[PDB]
Amino acid sequence: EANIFCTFDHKLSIADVGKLTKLVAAVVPIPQRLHLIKHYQLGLHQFVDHTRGYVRLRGLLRNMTLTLMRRVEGNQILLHVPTHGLLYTVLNTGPVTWEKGDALCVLPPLFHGPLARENLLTLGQWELVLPWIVPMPLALEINQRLLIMGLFSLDRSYEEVKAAVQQLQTITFRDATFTIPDPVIDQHLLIDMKTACLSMSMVANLASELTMTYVRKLALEDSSMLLVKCQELLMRLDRERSVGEPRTPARPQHVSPDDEIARLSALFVMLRQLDDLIREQVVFTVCDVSPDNKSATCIF
Amino acid sequence: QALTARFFVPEGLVEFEAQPGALLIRMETGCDSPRHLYISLYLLGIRASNVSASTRCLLESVYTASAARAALQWLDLGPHLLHRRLETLGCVKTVLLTCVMLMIPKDMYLTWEETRGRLQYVYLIIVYDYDGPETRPGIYVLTSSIAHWQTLVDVARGKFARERCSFVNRRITRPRQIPLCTGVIQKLGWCLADDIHTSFLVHKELKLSVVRLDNFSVELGDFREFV
Amino acid sequence: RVASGAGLPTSRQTTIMVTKYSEKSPITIPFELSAACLTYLRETFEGTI
Amino acid sequence: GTFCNRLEWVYFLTSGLAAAAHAIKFHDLNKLTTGKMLFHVQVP
Numbered sequence: 001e002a003n004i005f006c007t008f009d010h011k012l013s014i015a016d017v018g019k020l021t022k023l024v025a026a027v028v029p030i031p032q033r034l035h036l037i038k039h040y041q042l043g044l045h046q047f048v049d050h051t052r053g054y055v056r057l058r059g060l061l062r063n064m065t066l067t068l069m070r071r072v073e074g075n076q077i078l079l080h081v082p083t084h085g086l087l088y089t090v091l092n093t094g095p096v097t098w099e100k101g102d103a104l105c106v107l108p109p110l111f112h113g114p115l116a117r118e119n120l121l122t123l124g125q126w127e128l129v130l131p132w133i134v135p136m137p138l139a140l141e142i143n144q145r146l147l148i149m150g151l152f153s154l155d156r157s158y159e160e161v162k163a164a165v166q167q168l169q170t171i172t173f174r175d176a177t178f179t180i181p182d183p184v185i186d187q188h189l190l191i192d193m194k195t196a197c198l199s200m201s202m203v204a205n206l207a208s209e210l211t212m213t214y215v216r217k218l219a220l221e222d223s224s225m226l227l228v229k230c231q232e233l234l235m236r237l238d239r240e241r242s243v244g245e246p247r248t249p250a251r252p253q254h255v256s257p258d259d260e261i262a263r264l265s266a267l268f269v270m271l272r273q274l275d276d277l278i279r280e281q282v283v284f285t286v287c288d289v290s291p292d293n294k295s296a297t298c299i300f
Numbered sequence: 301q302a303l304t305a306r307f308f309v310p311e312g313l314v315e316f317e318a319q320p321g322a323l324l325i326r327m328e329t330g331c332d333s334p335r336h337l338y339i340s341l342y343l344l345g346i347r348a349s350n351v352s353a354s355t356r357c358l359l360e361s362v363y364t365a366s367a368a369r370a371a372l373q374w375l376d377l378g379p380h381l382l383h384r385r386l387e388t389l390g391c392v393k394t395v396l397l398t399c400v401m402l403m404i405p406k407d408m409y410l411t412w413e414e415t416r417g418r419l420q421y422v423y424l425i426i427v428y429d430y431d432g433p434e435t436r437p438g439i440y441v442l443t444s445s446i447a448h449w450q451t452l453v454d455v456a457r458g459k460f461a462r463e464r465c466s467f468v469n470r471r472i473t474r475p476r477q478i479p480l481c482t483g484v485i486q487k488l489g490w491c492l493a494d495d496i497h498t499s500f501l502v503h504k505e506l507k508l509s510v511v512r513l514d515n516f517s518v519e520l521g522d523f524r525e526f527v
Numbered sequence: 528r529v530a531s532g533a534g535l536p537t538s539r540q541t542t543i544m545v546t547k548y549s550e551k552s553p554i555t556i557p558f559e560l561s562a563a564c565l566t567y568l569r570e571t572f573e574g575t576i
Numbered sequence: 577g578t579f580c581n582r583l584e585w586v587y588f589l590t591s592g593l594a595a596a597a598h599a600i601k602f603h604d605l606n607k608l609t610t611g612k613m614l615f616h617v618q619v620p
Binding site for chain 3: 036
């Protein structure tokens, strides 16, 4: 039920149990949610495949179950699935800083750049690869960035998308630089683009006629710095749409409070439908962070 | 461990309800003096279009009562406005009843797998068809081994493409009618793969084809809408 | 119960309590006497040999 | 009816299978990783 026993077909030496005993309270993925499990399906090594799709690993990992590593004793592992709600502790090796207040998500790991490729467990051919535990803004940032990579790059030759993704794959998040290894397009990514286009078409349709011209009104009223950037973006989009002068707006005829309530509530529904592509639900809510940024206590 | 909810239920809805496997749902009525009614999901069955007309005739012949009448009226006001009115409370323990915070009709139950996954979460799915006169709300109860919400929404879009194109047909044909969503996913808990028994049910000297779920752990979920 | 291995399943149940009901089977036999036998048994006239 | 009171017990060393074994009690297997015996032999 709760405590899940794993095993090993191979013996562990003192070095193997030594590097295993510093992996306590690390989260590992288990695909099965069964009791007497085996170590080859433990971790992501059976699922990792370069040149296959990062988004496939992402979807299977967010579909995988999670568990906590505690108390090896020699050819035994004692995985324990964390119950929903109770405070637990975690220990991450992903080179990303944390925070006492934010939330967490679980992502397939990227290469940091030093390229160590040693996660302190290897049994013959079999290795252990740990899923990165990532704070929530970096998680939604990498999600939206792979979504822009999939959405933009269709029907383009390799040079323009290369010039895009040499600066798009890099993310500097709290003095740490990360790059996405496998941005290759997927049929699942195609259905994400399908939901994306239908949602943005629907928010194009049932938006109010005043919100379609609101930024023109605020442009004619006030000049601020972000407003200057917004006028730059909107007028460049207008001159890419039409070389004519965009007319000033007058008194709007169809003013109706229930109409705005209904159409903007359906609009909020459709923005939820679009955001749930990239907005991943949380997995850990921090109660405390260790000062060396190795471990933490998270409530989930 | 169980969270208790005691209920004062009138005698106008006690048909098909003395059994433990019942789910009461607090829907906001059109009338303001009770402000809500604890309807049963089997009353959501008779309104639904996906169910058989024989079970609908059974539900008519078992619910000739003014309480179910007025409840059907107050749910028949808003076209597809049910998710802005319906709000669940959990399963009945024992019937004036107690509730925690499991039987199901055979027709509205469905699966998209071979039900061999050991852990299986259960979900409620409404769908809003618009190729009928105004709206066909299809109720569905789904057991499945999937756990992550968004890939469940993607496989729901893969299975309900007719509902999606009917939704956008309603959007492009009736501009003055603004629909909110195709439906709502909401989980209720999970079962093991073994307790699902397709069996029979006899209540009020009336016959029914039921599917029982024994070890149903209950967890309340949010009405997460989806298109 | 056998002490099994690491993660292989087993039963938690011990000491079942089943019940055995009786099987009723009554038997009957009659025997008859003459009224002459009863009158010579009870009423013992003093008389002869 | 009455309880299943006819239960009996079995021991290890009462069984002859211990003739195949060399039973040793030692209270630290959980702190033990491997157990090795290494043999040296010169050939004639």
